[PDB]
Amino acid sequence: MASRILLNNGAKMPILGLGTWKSPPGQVTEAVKVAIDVGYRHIDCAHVYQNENEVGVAIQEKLREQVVKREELFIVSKLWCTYHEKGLVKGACQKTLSDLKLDYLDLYLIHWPTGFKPGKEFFPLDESGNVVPSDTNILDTWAAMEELVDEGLVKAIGISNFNHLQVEMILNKPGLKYKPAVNQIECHPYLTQEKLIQYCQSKGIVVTAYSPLGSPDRPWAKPEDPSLLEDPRIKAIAAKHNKTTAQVLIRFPMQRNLVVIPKSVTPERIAENFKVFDFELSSQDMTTLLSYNRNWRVCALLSCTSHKDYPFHEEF
Ligand SMILES: NC(=O)c1ccc[n+]([C@@H]2O[C@H](COP(=O)([O-])OP(=O)(O)OC[C@H]3O[C@@H](n4cnc5c(N)ncnc54)[C@H](OP(=O)(O)O)[C@@H]3O)[C@@H](O)[C@H]2O)c1
Ligand SMILES: O=C(O)CCCCc1ccc(-c2cccc(O)c2)s1
DSSP: OOSEEEOTTSOEEESBOBBOTTOOHHHHHHHHHHHHHHTOOEEEOOGGGTOHHHHHHHHHHHHHTTSSOGGGOEEEEEEOGGGOSGGGHHHHHHHHHHHHTOSOBSEEEESOSOOBOOSSOSSOBOTTSOBOBOOOOHHHHHHHHHHHHHTTSBSOEEEESOOHHHHHHHHTOTTOOSOOSEEEEEOBTTBOOHHHHHHHHHTTOEEEEESTTOOTTOTTOOTTSOOGGGOHHHHHHHHHTTSOHHHHHHHHHHTTTOEEOOBOOOHHHHHHHHOOSSOOOOHHHHHHHHTTOOOOOSOOOGGGTTSTTOSSSSOO
Protein backbone atom coordinates (compact mmCIF):
# COMPACT_ATOMS: atom_id res chain seq x y z
CA MET A 1 0.00 0.00 0.00
CA ALA A 2 1.66 3.18 -1.26
CA SER A 3 0.95 6.25 0.83
CA ARG A 4 -0.19 8.63 -1.96
CA ILE A 5 -2.44 8.49 -5.05
CA LEU A 6 -1.73 10.37 -8.28
CA LEU A 7 -4.33 12.99 -9.20
CA ASN A 8 -5.24 14.14 -12.71
CA ASN A 9 -3.46 17.47 -12.06
CA GLY A 10 -0.14 15.60 -11.69
CA ALA A 11 0.11 15.98 -7.89
CA LYS A 12 0.11 13.19 -5.31
CA MET A 13 -2.48 13.06 -2.53
CA PRO A 14 -1.98 11.15 0.76
CA ILE A 15 -4.55 8.37 1.01
CA LEU A 16 -5.04 8.90 4.76
CA GLY A 17 -6.04 12.31 6.10
CA LEU A 18 -7.40 13.80 9.32
CA GLY A 19 -11.02 14.94 9.37
CA THR A 20 -11.99 18.08 11.29
CA TRP A 21 -15.81 18.32 11.22
CA LYS A 22 -17.03 18.60 14.85
CA SER A 23 -13.47 18.92 16.19
CA PRO A 24 -13.93 21.51 18.94
CA PRO A 25 -11.96 24.71 18.33
CA GLY A 26 -10.29 24.34 21.74
CA GLN A 27 -9.07 20.82 20.91
CA VAL A 28 -8.40 20.84 17.17
CA THR A 29 -5.05 22.66 17.34
CA GLU A 30 -3.56 19.92 19.50
CA ALA A 31 -5.29 17.25 17.40
CA VAL A 32 -3.65 18.51 14.20
CA LYS A 33 -0.27 18.91 15.93
CA VAL A 34 -0.45 15.30 17.15
CA ALA A 35 -1.59 14.09 13.73
CA ILE A 36 1.38 15.72 11.99
CA ASP A 37 3.75 14.40 14.69
CA VAL A 38 2.52 10.80 14.14
CA GLY A 39 2.69 10.94 10.33
CA TYR A 40 -0.44 12.54 8.88
CA ARG A 41 0.29 14.73 5.88
CA HIS A 42 -3.31 15.48 4.75
CA ILE A 43 -5.90 17.52 6.68
CA ASP A 44 -9.53 17.81 5.54
CA CYS A 45 -11.01 21.22 6.41
CA ALA A 46 -14.00 23.41 5.61
CA HIS A 47 -15.09 26.98 6.27
CA VAL A 48 -18.48 25.72 7.49
CA TYR A 49 -16.76 23.72 10.26
CA GLN A 50 -15.92 27.07 11.95
CA ASN A 51 -12.50 25.86 13.14
CA GLU A 52 -10.12 26.66 10.27
CA ASN A 53 -8.27 29.34 12.26
CA GLU A 54 -7.45 26.78 14.96
CA VAL A 55 -6.46 24.12 12.41
CA GLY A 56 -4.21 26.73 10.87
CA VAL A 57 -2.45 27.48 14.17
CA ALA A 58 -1.34 23.85 14.29
CA ILE A 59 -0.19 23.74 10.66
CA GLN A 60 1.78 26.94 11.12
CA GLU A 61 3.50 25.72 14.30
CA LYS A 62 4.56 22.50 12.64
CA LEU A 63 5.90 24.41 9.61
CA ARG A 64 7.73 26.85 11.91
CA GLU A 65 9.10 23.92 14.01
CA GLN A 66 10.31 22.30 10.74
CA VAL A 67 8.49 19.08 11.58
CA VAL A 68 7.23 19.08 7.99
CA LYS A 69 7.72 21.23 4.88
CA ARG A 70 4.77 22.90 3.17
CA GLU A 71 5.43 20.82 0.03
CA GLU A 72 4.88 17.64 2.08
CA LEU A 73 1.45 18.72 3.39
CA PHE A 74 -1.80 18.24 1.48
CA ILE A 75 -4.39 20.69 2.80
CA VAL A 76 -7.99 20.46 1.58
CA SER A 77 -10.84 22.90 2.13
CA LYS A 78 -14.29 23.45 0.69
CA LEU A 79 -16.40 26.32 -0.69
CA TRP A 80 -19.60 26.60 1.34
CA CYS A 81 -23.03 26.71 -0.34
CA THR A 82 -23.60 30.44 0.35
CA TYR A 83 -20.53 31.33 -1.74
CA HIS A 84 -21.51 29.74 -5.09
CA GLU A 85 -21.99 33.17 -6.72
CA LYS A 86 -19.10 33.72 -9.12
CA GLY A 87 -18.12 37.03 -7.45
CA LEU A 88 -17.86 35.46 -3.97
CA VAL A 89 -15.67 32.42 -4.73
CA LYS A 90 -12.27 34.14 -4.61
CA GLY A 91 -12.99 35.88 -1.31
CA ALA A 92 -14.25 32.64 0.24
CA CYS A 93 -11.07 30.87 -0.82
CA GLN A 94 -8.89 33.72 0.45
CA LYS A 95 -10.68 33.76 3.83
CA THR A 96 -10.00 30.03 4.17
CA LEU A 97 -6.34 30.62 3.18
CA SER A 98 -6.02 33.41 5.74
CA ASP A 99 -7.55 31.29 8.50
CA LEU A 100 -5.41 28.25 7.63
CA LYS A 101 -2.38 30.57 7.31
CA LEU A 102 -1.50 29.23 3.91
CA ASP A 103 -0.62 30.80 0.61
CA TYR A 104 -2.27 28.01 -1.43
CA LEU A 105 -4.53 25.00 -0.92
CA ASP A 106 -3.62 21.62 -2.36
CA LEU A 107 -7.29 20.95 -3.12
CA TYR A 108 -10.42 23.11 -2.96
CA LEU A 109 -13.82 21.43 -3.28
CA ILE A 110 -17.33 22.61 -4.03
CA HIS A 111 -18.70 21.36 -0.70
CA TRP A 112 -22.21 20.51 -1.98
CA PRO A 113 -23.80 20.94 -5.44
CA THR A 114 -26.56 23.10 -3.89
CA GLY A 115 -26.04 26.88 -3.90
CA PHE A 116 -27.77 28.98 -1.25
CA LYS A 117 -28.57 32.68 -0.94
CA PRO A 118 -25.44 34.59 0.17
CA GLY A 119 -25.30 36.25 3.56
CA LYS A 120 -24.20 35.66 7.12
CA GLU A 121 -26.28 32.51 7.63
CA PHE A 122 -24.87 29.21 6.42
CA PHE A 123 -28.42 27.80 5.95
CA PRO A 124 -30.58 30.83 5.04
CA LEU A 125 -34.28 30.17 5.62
CA ASP A 126 -37.54 31.57 4.39
CA GLU A 127 -40.18 32.35 7.00
CA SER A 128 -41.62 28.84 6.49
CA GLY A 129 -38.32 27.04 7.18
CA ASN A 130 -37.08 26.13 3.69
CA VAL A 131 -33.51 26.82 2.63
CA VAL A 132 -33.35 29.70 0.14
CA PRO A 133 -31.48 28.73 -3.06
CA SER A 134 -29.22 30.75 -5.27
CA ASP A 135 -29.86 30.93 -8.98
CA THR A 136 -26.09 30.61 -9.89
CA ASN A 137 -25.68 27.55 -12.07
CA ILE A 138 -23.15 25.08 -10.69
CA LEU A 139 -21.25 25.08 -13.99
CA ASP A 140 -20.68 28.78 -13.44
CA THR A 141 -19.45 28.00 -9.93
CA TRP A 142 -17.05 25.51 -11.56
CA ALA A 143 -15.69 28.21 -13.87
CA ALA A 144 -15.05 30.35 -10.79
CA MET A 145 -13.16 27.42 -9.22
CA GLU A 146 -11.04 27.12 -12.38
CA GLU A 147 -10.04 30.76 -11.98
CA LEU A 148 -8.53 29.92 -8.57
CA VAL A 149 -6.14 27.44 -10.23
CA ASP A 150 -5.20 30.10 -12.77
CA GLU A 151 -4.46 32.61 -9.98
CA GLY A 152 -2.21 30.24 -8.03
CA LEU A 153 -4.49 30.07 -4.97
CA VAL A 154 -5.19 26.32 -5.28
CA LYS A 155 -3.26 23.47 -6.91
CA ALA A 156 -6.34 21.33 -7.62
CA ILE A 157 -10.11 21.72 -7.63
CA GLY A 158 -12.83 19.18 -7.07
CA ILE A 159 -16.36 18.44 -5.94
CA SER A 160 -18.13 16.82 -3.00
CA ASN A 161 -21.52 15.13 -2.68
CA PHE A 162 -22.03 15.21 -6.45
CA ASN A 163 -24.08 12.36 -7.91
CA HIS A 164 -23.00 10.72 -11.14
CA LEU A 165 -25.21 12.91 -13.34
CA GLN A 166 -23.77 16.01 -11.65
CA VAL A 167 -20.22 14.74 -12.18
CA GLU A 168 -21.19 14.11 -15.80
CA MET A 169 -22.56 17.65 -16.12
CA ILE A 170 -19.17 19.01 -15.00
CA LEU A 171 -17.33 16.67 -17.39
CA ASN A 172 -19.61 17.81 -20.26
CA LYS A 173 -19.43 21.54 -19.38
CA PRO A 174 -18.99 23.67 -22.52
CA GLY A 175 -15.47 25.01 -22.46
CA LEU A 176 -14.37 22.91 -19.46
CA LYS A 177 -10.81 23.90 -18.54
CA TYR A 178 -9.94 21.63 -15.59
CA LYS A 179 -11.63 18.35 -14.76
CA PRO A 180 -12.44 17.72 -11.10
CA ALA A 181 -9.50 16.02 -9.41
CA VAL A 182 -11.58 14.52 -6.58
CA ASN A 183 -15.18 13.76 -5.64
CA GLN A 184 -15.45 13.53 -1.84
CA ILE A 185 -18.47 11.41 -0.85
CA GLU A 186 -19.74 9.51 2.15
CA CYS A 187 -18.57 5.90 2.01
CA HIS A 188 -18.42 3.01 4.48
CA PRO A 189 -19.76 -0.58 4.70
CA TYR A 190 -23.36 0.68 5.05
CA LEU A 191 -23.03 3.02 2.01
CA THR A 192 -20.59 1.25 -0.30
CA GLN A 193 -21.06 3.46 -3.39
CA GLU A 194 -19.99 0.87 -6.01
CA LYS A 195 -21.62 2.62 -8.98
CA LEU A 196 -20.48 6.16 -8.20
CA ILE A 197 -16.94 5.07 -7.32
CA GLN A 198 -16.49 3.06 -10.52
CA TYR A 199 -17.84 5.94 -12.60
CA CYS A 200 -15.52 8.50 -11.03
CA GLN A 201 -12.46 6.23 -11.16
CA SER A 202 -13.18 5.39 -14.81
CA LYS A 203 -12.95 9.13 -15.58
CA GLY A 204 -9.69 9.60 -13.64
CA ILE A 205 -11.39 11.30 -10.67
CA VAL A 206 -10.09 10.18 -7.27
CA VAL A 207 -12.74 9.45 -4.64
CA THR A 208 -12.34 10.46 -0.99
CA ALA A 209 -14.49 8.56 1.54
CA TYR A 210 -15.92 10.65 4.39
CA SER A 211 -17.54 9.44 7.63
CA PRO A 212 -15.63 6.13 7.29
CA LEU A 213 -16.36 5.20 10.93
CA GLY A 214 -20.03 6.09 10.57
CA SER A 215 -19.67 9.45 12.35
CA PRO A 216 -20.67 8.33 15.89
CA ASP A 217 -20.50 11.99 17.02
CA ARG A 218 -22.90 13.22 14.32
CA PRO A 219 -25.35 15.62 15.99
CA TRP A 220 -28.51 13.82 14.82
CA ALA A 221 -27.63 10.24 15.83
CA LYS A 222 -30.56 8.13 17.05
CA PRO A 223 -30.54 4.86 19.04
CA GLU A 224 -32.23 2.89 16.23
CA ASP A 225 -29.50 3.77 13.74
CA PRO A 226 -27.06 1.05 12.66
CA SER A 227 -23.58 1.29 14.15
CA LEU A 228 -20.48 0.23 12.22
CA LEU A 229 -18.18 0.32 15.22
CA GLU A 230 -20.57 -1.97 17.13
CA ASP A 231 -21.41 -4.36 14.28
CA PRO A 232 -20.40 -7.87 15.43
CA ARG A 233 -19.63 -8.88 11.84
CA ILE A 234 -17.05 -6.09 11.46
CA LYS A 235 -15.65 -6.62 14.94
CA ALA A 236 -15.01 -10.26 13.95
CA ILE A 237 -12.91 -9.24 10.93
CA ALA A 238 -10.93 -6.88 13.16
CA ALA A 239 -10.33 -9.59 15.76
CA LYS A 240 -9.09 -12.00 13.08
CA HIS A 241 -6.48 -9.44 11.99
CA ASN A 242 -5.54 -8.33 15.54
CA LYS A 243 -6.66 -4.77 14.72
CA THR A 244 -9.40 -2.50 16.01
CA THR A 245 -12.76 -2.16 14.30
CA ALA A 246 -11.86 1.44 13.41
CA GLN A 247 -8.63 0.24 11.76
CA VAL A 248 -10.60 -2.22 9.59
CA LEU A 249 -13.03 0.56 8.65
CA ILE A 250 -10.11 2.78 7.57
CA ARG A 251 -8.23 0.05 5.68
CA PHE A 252 -11.37 -0.97 3.74
CA PRO A 253 -11.58 2.19 1.53
CA MET A 254 -7.80 2.24 1.13
CA GLN A 255 -7.97 -1.13 -0.64
CA ARG A 256 -10.61 0.27 -3.03
CA ASN A 257 -8.12 2.92 -4.22
CA LEU A 258 -9.94 5.58 -2.18
CA VAL A 259 -8.60 8.35 0.04
CA VAL A 260 -10.06 8.22 3.57
CA ILE A 261 -10.38 10.96 6.21
CA PRO A 262 -11.28 9.66 9.70
CA LYS A 263 -11.85 12.39 12.29
CA SER A 264 -10.56 12.35 15.85
CA VAL A 265 -9.49 14.82 18.53
CA THR A 266 -8.28 11.99 20.83
CA PRO A 267 -4.48 11.59 20.64
CA GLU A 268 -4.50 7.80 21.09
CA ARG A 269 -7.13 7.37 18.36
CA ILE A 270 -5.35 9.76 15.99
CA ALA A 271 -2.29 7.50 16.27
CA GLU A 272 -4.38 4.28 16.08
CA ASN A 273 -6.14 5.45 12.93
CA PHE A 274 -2.81 5.99 11.15
CA LYS A 275 -1.51 2.48 11.97
CA VAL A 276 -3.24 0.89 8.97
CA PHE A 277 -0.30 0.33 6.59
CA ASP A 278 0.83 -2.94 8.26
CA PHE A 279 -2.00 -5.37 7.39
CA GLU A 280 -4.21 -6.41 4.45
CA LEU A 281 -7.88 -7.34 4.21
CA SER A 282 -8.42 -10.41 2.04
CA SER A 283 -10.60 -10.30 -1.07
CA GLN A 284 -13.13 -12.32 0.94
CA ASP A 285 -12.97 -9.68 3.71
CA MET A 286 -13.50 -6.96 1.08
CA THR A 287 -16.48 -8.72 -0.51
CA THR A 288 -17.90 -9.43 2.95
CA LEU A 289 -17.63 -5.78 4.04
CA LEU A 290 -19.18 -4.67 0.72
CA SER A 291 -22.09 -7.03 1.39
CA TYR A 292 -23.14 -4.92 4.40
CA ASN A 293 -24.39 -2.07 2.19
CA ARG A 294 -27.63 -0.51 3.41
CA ASN A 295 -27.70 2.75 1.45
CA TRP A 296 -27.60 4.46 4.86
CA ARG A 297 -26.35 8.06 5.10
CA VAL A 298 -24.87 10.14 7.89
CA CYS A 299 -25.17 13.23 5.67
CA ALA A 300 -28.43 13.45 3.73
CA LEU A 301 -28.68 17.28 3.68
CA LEU A 302 -32.27 16.92 4.82
CA SER A 303 -33.06 20.65 4.86
CA CYS A 304 -32.45 20.89 1.08
CA THR A 305 -34.49 18.03 -0.41
CA SER A 306 -36.44 20.40 -2.71
CA HIS A 307 -33.36 22.22 -4.01
CA LYS A 308 -33.05 21.70 -7.76
CA ASP A 309 -29.50 20.38 -7.25
CA TYR A 310 -30.20 18.13 -4.26
CA PRO A 311 -27.90 15.16 -4.97
CA PHE A 312 -29.58 12.13 -3.36
CA HIS A 313 -32.81 11.60 -5.33
CA GLU A 314 -30.87 9.86 -8.11
CA GLU A 315 -29.86 6.23 -7.65
CA PHE A 316 -26.21 7.28 -7.77
N1 LIG B 1 -17.70 16.64 2.28
C1 LIG B 1 -18.66 16.52 3.18
O1 LIG B 1 -19.83 16.87 2.96
C2 LIG B 1 -18.32 15.90 4.51
C3 LIG B 1 -19.33 15.42 5.34
C4 LIG B 1 -19.01 14.73 6.49
C5 LIG B 1 -17.68 14.54 6.82
N2 LIG B 1 -16.72 15.06 6.03
C6 LIG B 1 -15.26 14.95 6.43
O2 LIG B 1 -14.99 13.62 6.80
C7 LIG B 1 -14.47 13.58 8.15
C8 LIG B 1 -14.78 12.27 8.82
O3 LIG B 1 -16.21 12.08 8.94
P1 LIG B 1 -16.99 12.32 10.32
O4 LIG B 1 -16.32 13.37 11.13
O5 LIG B 1 -18.41 12.52 9.94
O6 LIG B 1 -16.92 10.93 11.10
P2 LIG B 1 -15.93 9.67 11.29
O7 LIG B 1 -14.56 10.07 10.93
O8 LIG B 1 -16.60 8.52 10.62
O9 LIG B 1 -16.11 9.43 12.87
C9 LIG B 1 -15.62 10.40 13.82
C10 LIG B 1 -16.03 9.90 15.18
O10 LIG B 1 -15.37 8.65 15.45
C11 LIG B 1 -14.64 8.74 16.66
N3 LIG B 1 -13.42 7.96 16.51
C12 LIG B 1 -12.33 8.31 15.76
N4 LIG B 1 -11.38 7.42 15.74
C13 LIG B 1 -11.88 6.40 16.53
C14 LIG B 1 -11.33 5.17 16.93
N5 LIG B 1 -10.12 4.74 16.55
N6 LIG B 1 -12.06 4.40 17.76
C15 LIG B 1 -13.27 4.83 18.14
N7 LIG B 1 -13.90 5.97 17.82
C16 LIG B 1 -13.14 6.72 17.02
C17 LIG B 1 -14.41 10.22 16.90
O11 LIG B 1 -14.24 10.49 18.30
P3 LIG B 1 -13.16 11.54 18.92
O12 LIG B 1 -12.96 12.65 17.92
O13 LIG B 1 -13.82 11.99 20.22
O14 LIG B 1 -11.90 10.73 19.16
C18 LIG B 1 -15.71 10.80 16.37
O15 LIG B 1 -16.76 10.64 17.32
C19 LIG B 1 -15.08 14.83 8.77
O16 LIG B 1 -14.50 15.20 10.01
C20 LIG B 1 -14.89 15.83 7.64
O17 LIG B 1 -13.52 16.23 7.63
C21 LIG B 1 -17.01 15.72 4.89
O1 LIG C 1 -21.42 19.06 5.12
C1 LIG C 1 -20.48 18.66 5.95
O2 LIG C 1 -19.30 18.57 5.64
C2 LIG C 1 -20.94 18.29 7.33
C3 LIG C 1 -22.03 19.19 7.90
C4 LIG C 1 -21.58 20.64 8.02
C5 LIG C 1 -22.69 21.64 8.31
C6 LIG C 1 -23.61 21.26 9.42
C7 LIG C 1 -24.92 20.89 9.33
C8 LIG C 1 -25.51 20.62 10.55
C9 LIG C 1 -24.67 20.78 11.61
C10 LIG C 1 -25.01 20.68 13.04
C11 LIG C 1 -26.31 20.36 13.42
C12 LIG C 1 -26.66 20.35 14.76
C13 LIG C 1 -25.72 20.64 15.73
C14 LIG C 1 -24.42 20.94 15.36
O3 LIG C 1 -23.49 21.20 16.32
C15 LIG C 1 -24.06 20.96 14.01
S1 LIG C 1 -23.10 21.27 11.07
